[PDB]
Structures are given as C-alpha cells and as structure tokens.
Design a protein around this ligand. Structure first.
Ligand SMILES: Nc1ncnc2c1ncn2[C@@H]1O[C@H](COP(=O)(O)OP(=O)(O)O)[C@@H](O)[C@H]1O
Ligand SMILES: Nc1ncnc2c1ncn2[C@@H]1O[C@H](COP(=O)(O)OP(=O)(O)O)[C@@H](O)[C@H]1O
Ligand SMILES: Nc1ncnc2c1ncn2[C@@H]1O[C@H](COP(=O)(O)OP(=O)(O)O)[C@@H](O)[C@H]1O
Ligand SMILES: Nc1ncnc2c1ncn2[C@@H]1O[C@H](COP(=O)(O)OP(=O)(O)O)[C@@H](O)[C@H]1O
Lengths: 60, 61, 61, 60, 62, 60
C-alpha cells in the first residue's frame, strides 16, 4: 500500500491539502483521520469524504 | 476500526441536521435515520433512501 | 442490506408510487415490481430494468 | 436473479430496446447476447456495452 | 459463466479491426485493440494508450 | 497482465505521462509509484490519484 502511508504523512504532519472530487469540486483543509472507504477532512468543520468520489489528493 | 461507522452513528444518535452532497452536485438535507453497508436513510419532509455510491461528502449542517 | 431490502420490499409489497433519481439527476417514476442484488424493475408504461449502481435516491413520490 | 431472464426475454422476442447510459446517452438496437459484465447490442453494427456504464434497459 | 467480452475484444485484436471506444464522459477514442486484461485495454492510435475499462461505456467496431 | 508492466515501464524509464481523468481533466508529470488503487504522480509536487478517477494513461 502506497495510499495509507501517503495520507498518514499528511495527517501526521498536519499538511494543508486539496482534495479534488471526480466532479471537479475542490475541497481544502487538513486530513484528521481515514479508513478503508472515507477520509475526514477538516477546515472550519469536519466533513466525511467518500474515497469513491475523490479523484486526487495533493498538498496545497 | 471503521471511521465511517462512528461518524454516521454519531450523526444518527445526535439527531442533528445533516448535509449530504451527491456526486452530481445536489445537496440533500435532513436527519440520518439509519444506514447500513450500502445506503443511508435521510429523513426530512419524507424518508428517502440514499445510495452511498452516489455520495461525495457528509457534514453536519 | 438490513435497511435496503426492507425499504424496497415495503414499497413493492404496498405498491407505492416511487421516484427513483439517477446519478445524472434524471428522475424516473413508477412502481417497483421487483429487485435483486444489482437491479430494480420499475413499471410505469412498460417494465424497465434500472441498475442500482446508477441510482442516487429512492423515495415515495 | 432478475437480469438474465429480463435480458433473455428481450433477446428471445427480438424486441428493440433503449439502453440509457449513466451519462444520459441513449443507445438503441436489439440484444444479441450478454454476460456477467457486458451486453452485446445490435444496431447498424454490433457494439459491446459495459453494464457499469448503463442506467436503464427499456423495451423501446 | 462463459465470457463474451474476452472473445469479442480478442477477435478485434486478432484481426486488427478499427474500433471506437466511447468513454463514460462522452469522449470518443479511435484506433485498434492492441491488448487487454481484466481491468484495462491498450488502444493503438497514432500512439499507444492504456484505457481503464471502468471509464468505458461501449466498444464499437467500424 | 497488461496494466502493471505498462505503468512500471513508464515509471522505470521516467517517461513524462498524461493521465486523463473521468471528468476530462488532464494531469501531467512522472509516475513516482503506484499500488492496486492509486498512482503517485510527480509534477511540481506529489499528488495521489485514485485509479477509479482515471480514464486513460499515455506518454505525453
Ligand atoms: N486533480 C484534479 N482532479 C479533478 N479536478 C481537477 C484537478 N485539478 C484541477 N481540477 C479542476 O479543474 C478546474 C480548473 O483547474 P485549475 O484552474 O487548476 O483550478 P484550481 O485552482 O481550483 O485547481 C477546476 O474546477 C479544478 O477543480
Ligand atoms: N434525491 C435526489 N437525487 C438526485 N437528484 C435530485 C434529488 N432531488 C432533486 N434532484 C434534482 O435536482 C433538481 C432540482 O430539483 P427540482 O427540480 O426542484 O425537483 P425536485 O423535487 O424534483 O427535486 C432536479 O432537476 C432534480 O433532478
Ligand atoms: N428510462 C430512462 N432511463 C434513464 N434516462 C432516461 C429514461 N428516459 C429518458 N431519460 C433521459 O431523459 C432525457 C429526456 O427523455 P425523454 O424526453 O423522456 O425521452 P427521450 O429519451 O426520447 O429524450 C433523455 O435524453 C434521457 O437521457
Ligand atoms: N483519452 C482521453 N481521455 C479523456 N479525455 C480526453 C482524452 N483525449 C482527449 N481528451 C479531452 O478532449 C478535449 C479536446 O482536446 P484534446 O483532444 O483533449 O487535446 P489534448 O490530446 O492535446 O489534450 C481535451 O480537453 C481533453 O481533455
């Protein structure tokens, strides 16, 4: 797995990220936690994002 | 440990308003009544079954 | 499918007019004749097979 | 299960169908054959349609 | 339980039949089936490209 | 049998690639690594791209 260490490093280091969705929407914040299917992204509030709707995860 | 289950279980038990964004950009609003592996039942004026595969994100309103 | 199946079976056994929204935003209407793991058979003018993978939400109309 | 007898009834009676794709595109023709993952649709040509791309199959 | 997809694509590859592959977003690719596996098709055009089946709606000979 | 050798050849030889996404967006850069579900694309930065969001991968 490449996915878990990649997200874990962003989460551990509190790196601001952009999460692009498959419909072109750009979400921004910090990754707080994740599991096999979802990622918890926090900006002003915490939202649960389904990985199936995610296209790309990038440091912002 | 699932993160999805505690997140949706907290929203369900809290009975708070929730915003569900669909992959096509539509935003649904209501209370989470229950959920299983594939669907969430959202309650507003009516009770509706939402397939998780169609959801991009879930946030308390 | 501890939720999915009882939700759909009730709509089917009770012959409730339903709305089925697809992930592209199209809204189909009719009665659920039957369903299995993968598809719903919706009847209005004719019987049509809807793949669950293309469905966003099912609600009584 | 429902797919096989639904698709086979259409095949056996050679009834023209509309296959609507998840993106709204409408295909037309007759069901020639199908398997777990694809449907062969016969019109002016024989085209292989991936079920994962289909929203609905309707007698046309 | 017998595949229709595999002999279909295989025959296309075998005889170098010109195809159109339509994507789920409406984009039309053109060329020849070069190879394929469980998850991808390699389509030979003016260049060689790997196409994910999950992104494919239809494969059309013409 | 086709995907792994294809992506590894690009990675190993450091060939500049275009990754087209299901929403039409085109990403460019070098394949850093990949696993079963993701490809790490290196550009100015490292982005994790979900394969479910990819339609095509081609040398640019
Ligand atoms: N990796 C990606 N996945 C999905 N959509 C993307 C990606 N990169 C850019 N986009 C989308 O393409 C559009 C144009 O991109 P760009 O001009 O770079 O805007 P942004 O500043 O939002 O990245 C935006 O809607 C953006 O969200
Ligand atoms: N639960 C849903 N899932 C997907 N799309 C929806 C849903 N509810 C409404 N829409 C879409 O959002 C758009 C706005 O809704 P509108 O036209 O006012 O009718 P409505 O009661 O049919 O939503 C409609 O075109 C409809 O297709
Ligand atoms: N049974 C169906 N399943 C999925 N989508 C449909 C269905 N019927 C119509 N649509 C979509 O709604 C749009 C308008 O359809 P409508 O005017 O009812 O008939 P037509 O399909 O001839 O245009 C179509 O372009 C199609 O994408
Ligand atoms: N294989 C492909 N998959 C998805 N989209 C594509 C593909 N090839 C081209 N497109 C899209 O078609 C649009 C029309 O121009 P395009 O053919 O892309 O030029 P370019 O090949 O140089 O990117 C582009 O914006 C591009 O995003």
């Amino acid at each position: 797995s490449l996915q878990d260490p990649f997200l874990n490093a962003l989460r551990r280091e509190r790196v601001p990220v952009s999460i692009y969705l498959v419909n072109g929407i750009k979400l921004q914040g910090q990754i707080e936690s994740f599991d096999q299917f979802v990622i918890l992204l926090k900006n002003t509030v915490s939202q649960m994002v389904y990985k199936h709707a995610i296209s790309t995860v990038v440091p912002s």
